[PDB]
A paper describes a structure:
We describe an anti-Nup93 inhibitory nanobody that prevents the incorporation of Nup358 and the Nup214·88·62 complex, indicating a specific arrest in the assembly of the cytoplasmic ring. To map the functional epitope of [name]-[name], we solved its structure in complex with the α-solenoid domain of xNup93 (residues 168–820) and xNup93-Nb2t by X-ray crystallography and cryo-EM. In contrast, [name]-[name] recognizes an epitope in the middle of the Nup93 α-solenoid (i.e., residues 450–536). This nanobody cannot interfere with the direct Nup93-Nup188 and Nup93-Nup205 interactions, since it efficiently purifies the two complexes from HeLa and Xenopus egg extracts. However, the alignment of our structure with recent cryo-EM maps of the NPC revealed that [name]-[name] clashes with a Nup205 molecule from a neighboring Nup93·Nup205 heterodimer, which would plausibly explain a failed assembly of the cytoplasmic ring. The epitope of [name]-[name] is poorly accessible in properly assembled NPCs, but becomes accessible in NPCs upon Nup358-depletion. The inhibitory anti-Nup93 nanobody imposed a late block that impairs assembly of the cytoplasmic double-ring, as well as the cytoplasmic appendices. The resulting NPCs lack Nup358, the Nup214·88·62 complex as well as ~1/3 of their [name]-APD-binding sites.
Numbering used by the authors: 2 to 127
């Protein structure tokens, strides 16, 4: 498959700050796919963060980010977004976007996703 994902928007911020991650997809339209965000730490290789259905009407979130993060998408631009509010030191991680092409709703397990990007580093200073 010739699908390529490029995450951006990572950075170094203070506790309480906000970031807006984005991911641009090339090689295929995303308009029939669910899309997910995961994050990598020493303790979790791909911790689930968020997932959004093909039209953007539904979303699910990892327990530790509920109420703070918002996932969105723009199918015509082939882009997915993760708004991160109220950042905490334990949100420090490399953040990845990935494709769910199972056409079976929203899921939270990394092995069900494809076409991982190389991620974007988020560092939240204590």
């Amino acid at each position: 498959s010739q699908v390529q994902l490029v995450e951006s928007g990572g950075g170094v911020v203070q506790t309480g700050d906000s970031l807006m991650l984005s991911c641009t997809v090339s090689g295929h339209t995303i308009d029939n796919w669910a899309m997910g965000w995961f994050r990598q730490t020493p303790r979790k290789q791909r911790e689930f963060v968020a997932a959004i259905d093909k039209r953007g009407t539904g979303a699910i979130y990892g327990n530790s980010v509920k109420g703070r993060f918002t996932v969105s998408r723009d199918n015509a631009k082939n882009m997915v977004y993760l708004r991160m509010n109220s950042l905490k030191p334990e949100d420090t991680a490399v953040y990845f976007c990935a494709v769910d092409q199972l056409n079976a709703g929203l899921g939270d397990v990394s092995y069900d996703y494809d076409y991982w990007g190389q991620g974007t580093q988020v560092t939240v200073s204590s």
